[PDB]
Symmetry: D2
Subunit: 257 residues, 4 copies
């Protein structure tokens, strides 16, 4: 691959799901990729599978993990061109009264402050390389979702933070963009559906939530990330929707009384 | 009513439906209201019913009708403070290949150029009064809709035009805003449902398209218009959604293949 | 005042600035208002000034403060119809590398989790009254701002949270909306400008950031809040911009190389 | 080039500016490209320059031109995979009272109905190929612009139409997306600046309107188009901003009175 050759990319949560799709896409483009993940299973196997990907164990909520991730990346590959903040979690559905402030704070630690912390530690190197930041947010940050107040709020914050940082880093040539996926078929989606009374019905509903009639693939989020890194040189602060059109038109969400 | 007392308001398409709800709201606020409509039936009765509303027959697609509407309004009431461009039409559902360029042009004449023409003729008087313009657009201009390519396009244009005009008229103190209703229960909604194989099913689906579980009322669009005219003095170029939350969250719009 | 008569409203941060403008607007509408604030000076004086407003000392970041705020409101007035989450802070400008994770967390405590906590404690009473929630967010949550990564992120979260909660509470008839002000002339604005090398220049730039050529008033945010509470009965999950058109058109933000 | 090899692309207005950048990008990707333009000068030279691009004279406002364009494309290349509706015009700046209904209609003919007409004639072939439609809209359709009411309205319509058509064509696998460029340095930009009292000042202002401090290049819009055609397989109805961040943050657009 040639479109991002000679570049060094860090993908957090890259061991499975969307993150692994982004890893594969960047390897396919000719980049060297550092797979960051808190769990060893998927990321270790991915390093063995892909020439040009290596795995570094790193919990993005642990600042010393993240510092070591950046310093190890520079020590081993000599530059850093792109950070993809994909690490994140969607808790099982919760009515608002079932949420807690402390659960909210914990989700903010992963989905929001983990992204903030790696970005901060990476920006000195991204400025040297005129690199770029790609945050993986969520369509539900923009349109809301039921039984997910903390999750929706963390993604609203990521999308907004992306624009604020794009403004701060534009004088240095560092672009900052986000991708907002809708329903992408991943192990997280499958686990969440399994908790439901009728998992197959839940999966069927998830497919029909978009006009294309299917969920998206990790590879399709990966292609969007490679575009933003390698070819979107006049794009900064944008929110790239990868949703199959879920946000378009009327649907079933529930005569004038 | 006191909140818009001494003000003179023109509402196009005010003979029935949303337009009549806006007329009643402005009368209730203390304004004098000119009901403009191409059909006599509803608007004539409304003039008889409401002290402080009068009916002027006017087809907004006919420039000489509109010129007479403005000059008659000034001749009879001495000022013009607010123009509500509500006149518009939603054709029966049409697949894209069933549309025509000439039908598209005709819908543009009513939904878009009629609004443009009255606004243009009224702005000299609105500048003298530091008045304001309220365009009735549609939620589907923002999110799209199936089988309505011309309609959606005309409303996308109205919402965009509202922002361009807000920019041009801001130095003169003239605010320009729009309201984007979703499903409002009106005679147009009822007629359109009647064409469907199961009208009651279509009406039931329309109610459940919003999380509030009902369609909106003309009076609720009317309250939003009075707010924009009388109290939104720092609002210009905004799109006020009156939709019951139809744009929020996932719905049925149609595993990763 | 009649438009919200017999209703009971809680406004956080109501001692000064936007919050005090919202308090006055709701009193003017006939509501009883509980002024919540962490500082005594402004809120105590406002209680003495306004018949029908009372002051309750409450730091919204302290859960026991908030519990007492809700229980005292119910004990004293017998119902709760509207909660306005206005309490919030905009730190002095900070480049991203000057921010800290712990400062970010602290700003999240005030701007985001304080709003979450009062909303949660109030919703059982809002469900009984078919009341509503109004969150005061910020235009910069939607469009970003330079040197304000934590602030922008907290407001992106508030706006997103508003839509998620609107979805959860719609089956109970509880509407949840937000207002996104732009530049409103308040003591916070004046303090922030005073830190600048040329405060008058900074204030002049703030006025010209919107096409209307002035900043907004607290009373204008207050009118928008009363509209959402009392008359926007088909509005839920909306973001009402009160910005003077700052988001419209091109401006100075910094030939094809 | 390999990423869109074996595909056949029609680009309207492809003789110069953004359109020519899109032509070059698709040729570079391995596609065969039909350059459609109303003027011969640029498009004829481009056909001679690029193996795999051919020029067909076609005014998109003339329905018989467009029918011949589609039938000639099929006759010569055997399939049609992507239509890029780029043809469009930005009139010199006009205050609203300087616009006319008939000038508005004429601009609608080019910017809106030309796009509608080619799309309609091409969709039977796009359905056979599971092809896609890319409309070139404008950032000012979304945020407005001063002294451009007709132009802004036509682009608001294109962006909205894109979502409506995405909904209609999703069951057939045909994606419909748009690109919204901001300031791209083109012959149209240069001509418009030349009309200004100080062209260099106008160009300088155009560069500083985005946080990246420069205008965009046609090649950068071209890269975004190739991404949408070849790799955005789960994107439909999206508006891809190619603006350098012009829509982000506050700027100069013109204390609380
Ligand atoms: N799947 C969807 O439909 C969907 C939709 C919108 C947004 N998203 C977002 O996409 C991203 C990826 O989601 P997914 O579906 O691939 O989920 P996933 O659970 O399948 O994979 C997430 C990966 O991140 C890792 N991770 C979690 N916490 C971490 C931590 N503290 N440090 C490092 N790595 C950590 C996990 O171990 C896992 O390998 C998330 O940010 C999610 O919010 C997903
Ligand atoms: N009803 C909804 O759910 C809905 C949703 C979104 C937007 N809207 C918009 O709201 C507006 C009003 O719609 P409605 O549901 O009340 O429709 P309606 O058919 O019930 O009423 C429209 C009124 O406008 C009049 N009118 C039509 N053409 C006219 C012309 N050329 N000149 C003057 N008057 C003319 C009609 O005679 C009628 O009195 C329209 O612009 C429509 O697009 C409606
Ligand atoms: N002023 C603007 O231009 C502007 C723009 C956009 C959004 N906003 C938002 O509007 C809201 C009000 O801002 P303002 O300009 O009136 O600011 P302000 O500083 O003038 O007033 C805020 C009030 O909230 C109180 N408060 C702060 N922390 C609190 C806590 N922990 N518990 C209880 N009360 C607390 C303060 O004591 C003060 O009385 C904030 O949420 C702010 O982010 C303001
Ligand atoms: N340049 C910018 O900053 C900018 C910004 C936003 C959007 N746009 C849009 O991008 C598109 C291209 O603009 P540009 O800057 O390259 O302009 P341009 O004037 O440099 O090129 C437009 C091309 O389209 C052709 N064309 C015009 N009318 C036609 C017709 N009837 N039939 C066929 N071809 C026709 C012209 O002959 C020319 O070759 C337009 O739709 C424009 O609105 C441009
Ligand atoms: C949930 C499954 C899991 C989805 C999911 C999964 C991962 C993610 O990062 C975001 C989302 C948002 C929507 C979620 C669904 C709503 C209804 C349902 O069954
Ligand atoms: C249509 C009924 C009529 C609706 C309507 C009615 C009037 C209007 O100005 C806009 C709309 C948009 C949605 C329309 C429905 C989509 C499906 C259906 O049955
Ligand atoms: C800041 C002043 C204070 C503004 C302010 C004040 C309060 C607030 O809640 C939000 C904002 C956002 C914009 C801020 C300005 C940007 C440049 C400047 O000088
Ligand atoms: C105009 C130059 C030409 C720009 C232009 C050029 C082409 C186009 O398709 C859109 C636009 C929108 C902005 C326009 C500028 C605003 C101020 C100015 O000088
Ligand atoms: Na490897
Ligand atoms: Na009367
Ligand atoms: Na009192
Ligand atoms: Na050639």
């Amino acid at each position: 691959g040639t479109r991002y050759a000679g570049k060094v990319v860090v993908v957090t949560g890259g061991g499975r799901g969307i993150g692994a799709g982004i890893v594969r896409a960047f390897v396919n483009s000719g980049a060297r990729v550092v797979i960051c993940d808190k769990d060893e299973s998927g990321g270790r196997a991915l390093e063995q599978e892909l020439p040009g990907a290596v795995f570094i164990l790193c919990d993005v909520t642990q600042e010393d993990d993240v510092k070591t991730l950046v310093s190890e990346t520079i020590r081993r590959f000599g530059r850093l061109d792109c950070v993809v903040n994909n690490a994140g979690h969607h808790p099982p559905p919760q009515r608002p009264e079932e949420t807690s402030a402390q659960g909210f704070r914990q989700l903010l630690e992963l989905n929001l402050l983990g992204t903030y912390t790696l970005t901060k530690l990476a920006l000195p190197y991204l400025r040297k390389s005129q690199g770029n930041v790609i945050n993986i947010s969520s369509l539900v940050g923009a349109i809301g979702q039921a039984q997910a107040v903390p999750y929706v709020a963390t993604k609203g914050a990521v999308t907004a933070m992306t624009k604020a940082l794009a403004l701060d880093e534009s004088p240095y040539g560092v672009r900052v963009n986000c991708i907002s996926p809708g329903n992408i078929w991943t192990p997280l989606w499958e686990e969440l559906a399994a908790l439901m009374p009728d998992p197959r019905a839940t999966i069927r509903e998830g497919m029909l939530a978009q006009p294309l009639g299917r969920m998206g693939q990790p590879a399709e989020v990966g292609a969007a990330a490679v575009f933003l890194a390698s070819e979107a040189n006049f794009c900064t602060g944008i929110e790239l929707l990868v949703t199959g059109g879920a946000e378009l038109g009327y649907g079933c969400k529930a005569p004038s009384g």
